[PDB]
Amino acid sequence: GARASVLSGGELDKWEKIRLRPGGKKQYKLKHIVWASRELERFAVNPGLLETSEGCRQILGQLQPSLQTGSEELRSLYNTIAVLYCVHQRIDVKDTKEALDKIEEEQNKSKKKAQQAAADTGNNSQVSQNY
């Protein structure tokens, strides 16, 4: 149809399903979509970007390099913006982590060139046992 609000009827469905964390018991809710909308405007970023598959991608670009020295305020954003972004990119995740990895994989070439100082340690890989 047309473009309005952040998450439409369909998106709202999957959104409520997605969880803030993989090992948590607090699913996603409108409270998180609005909580970020009010926090975005504070960072000179209009909340209108949250309802755009493009904006969500840009917002993450500024938080990506900020994650290094970002507080709970930053992490929270990257969390919501993540699950939301995936939704707008025709992606269906289960938690905030799954939605995060999907992005890190698309910008894996950029990440490598954005952590020279943080490129002197091991990086163990996580496997999936259950479903």
Ligand X SMILES: CCCC(=O)OC[C@H](COP(=O)(O)O[C@@H]1[C@H](O)[C@H](O)[C@@H](OP(=O)(O)O)[C@H](OP(=O)(O)O)[C@H]1O)OC(=O)CCC
Query: Helix/strand/coil (H, E, C) string of 56-78?
Result: HHHHHHHHCCCHHHCCHHHHHHH
- The verdict on 37 binding ligand X (CB under 6 A) reads no
CB 73 within 8 A of CB 81: no
Residue 72: name its binding partner from ligand X, ligand MYR, none (Cβ under 5 to 8 Å by kind): ligand X
- The verdict on 18 binding ligand X (CB under 6 A) reads no
- The verdict on 10 binding ligand MYR (CB under 6 A) reads yes
Q: How far apart are CA 130 and CA 88, in angstroms?
A: 27
Sign of CA dihedral 28, 34, 39, 45: positive
- The verdict on 23 binding ligand MYR (CB under 6 A) reads no
In the list 6, 9, 116, 126, the residue contacting ligand MYR (rule: CB under 6 A) is 9
Residue 1: name its binding partner from ligand MYR, ligand X, none (Cβ under 5 to 8 Å by kind): ligand MYR
